[PDB]
């Protein structure tokens, strides 16, 4: 529960190291809302949704067009749409958060099985929860469903491969 | 505009799910009624909590 917000949080910022500062944002704002619904909180993890804030506006201020639009008003404006409006962000998401769940049911498919993919799968349970929570008003409930199901073949098969029984 | 080039290529953010589509032809090989049920879900996800912990780190 609460410690699924710090993986979010520590992963957000795998993003910033490979330059996905983009997909570490919307990571920031699910573990932020997390912490807000989350019946316990801490001093330490209600001072850590604050710092989180902190970092949305930044980013979002980076992007946000209001100075850098002068610098560029064309090709920043257009990545704009990608944290300003939710529901294109939502595709995108979707889409690598897809893309990553996809290369591991192929890998599944004959790619080798090691510890590393073990860890590999984890992350890939982390996106699939933020991209619900970050809109569970554009996702039907049935729709949900689909997208849960891909999360549950990765906690089975996750649990195979630790067991030895696929390789 | 290059929003999508920015991002990734020409493609279209729609043409990646397009590669999603080979997922399930993925999944359809190895066995098109392979369903959660045919598979010990119950027994594996009591495991793999366990396991998470081992990957994880407890507080």
């Known amino acids: 529960m609460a410690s699924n917000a710090a993986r979010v949080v520590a992963t957000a910022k795998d993003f910033d190291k490979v330059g996905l500062g983009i997909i570490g944002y919307y990571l920031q704002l699910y573990a932020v809302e997390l912490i807000l619904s989350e019946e316990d909180r801490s001093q330490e993890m209600t001072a850590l949704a604050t710092e989180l804030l902190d970092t949305i506006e930044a980013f979002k201020k980076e992007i946000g067009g209001e100075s850098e639009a002068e610098d560029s008003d064309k090709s920043l404006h257009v ?89 | 505009i290059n929003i999508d080039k920015l991002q990734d290529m020409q493609d279209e953010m729609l043409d990646l799910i397009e590669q999603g589509d080979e997922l399930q032809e993925v999944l359809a090989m190895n066995n098109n009624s392979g369903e959660l049920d045919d598979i010990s879900d119950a027994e594996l996800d009591a495991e793999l909590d366990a396991l998470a912990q081992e990957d994880f780190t407890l507080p």
């Open chain 1, 79 to 167: 990545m704009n749409t990608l944290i300003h409006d939710q529901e294109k962000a939502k595709i995108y998401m979707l889409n690598f958060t897809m893309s990553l769940y996809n290369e591991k049911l192929k890998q599944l498919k004959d790619g080798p099985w090691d510890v590393m993919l073990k860890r590999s799968l984890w992350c890939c349970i982390d996106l699939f929860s933020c991209i619900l929570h970050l809109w569970k008003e554009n996702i039907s409930e049935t729709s949900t469903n689909s997208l849960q199901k891909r999360i549950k073949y990765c906690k089975i098969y996750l649990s195979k491969l630790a067991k030895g029984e696929i390789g």
